Amino acid sequence: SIMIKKPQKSKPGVFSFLDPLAYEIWMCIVFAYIGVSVVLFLVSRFSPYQSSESTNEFGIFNSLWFSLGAFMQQGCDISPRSLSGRIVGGVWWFFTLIIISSYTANLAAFLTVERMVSPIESAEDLSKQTEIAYG
């Protein structure tokens, strides 16, 4: 068997808050966040028929504001105000209910972890590197 020293308890780093959800889920979040806002932009501003276009207040940037607003639990001032953008928005509300309730289930367990580092185990870097001696 190989004896080495004790290591020191590595505390979690800076960007650990996004730790309980794996990166792929975060990727799909950003993609769905773009898609929902763009689809909601498309449903409005679609020649609504002297107000024939400015019936709503949803531009692309207002929608980009609304989706981010509805995700983090504080709704904005405006509302979809017509049909068929709202069966986007209700599905997005269902999405933001099911996601962050799964986010905040055991968050405090992920900010005090302190797992170890373990440089070598099956030695073979004692062949490879030149740094750590052994006898």
Binding site: K11, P12, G13, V14, F15, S16, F17, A108, L111, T112
Partner: protein, 88 residues
């Protein structure tokens, strides 16, 4: 040859090994590995959140500074068609 097998048969080796390795669990993790502490959150846990919070402020202020810079002093409906055809 006949004697060591008696001690292997009757578990005397197990008893001696238990006495001289496992009854003297002294240092740390063997004893305290199965206990529980609840929590108390310190600032060392939550620091990058404050870092992001402060950096966002400077970014937002920098944005309005160059906004007031530009409005102190797309384009060509038309070439938007060029932009979307090269983008497609």
């Amino acid at each position: 040859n006949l004697a060591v097998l008696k001690l292997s048969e009757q578990g005397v080796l197990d008893k001696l090994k238990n006495k001289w390795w496992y009854d003297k669990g002294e240092c740390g993790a063997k004893d305290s590995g199965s206990k529980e502490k609840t929590s108390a959150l310190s600032l060392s846990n939550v620091a990058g959140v404050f870092y992001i919070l402060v950096g966002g402020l400077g970014l937002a202020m920098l944005v309005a500074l160059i906004e007031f810079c530009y409005k102190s002093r797309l384009f060509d409906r038309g070439v938007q068609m060029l932009l979307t055809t090269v983008g497609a």
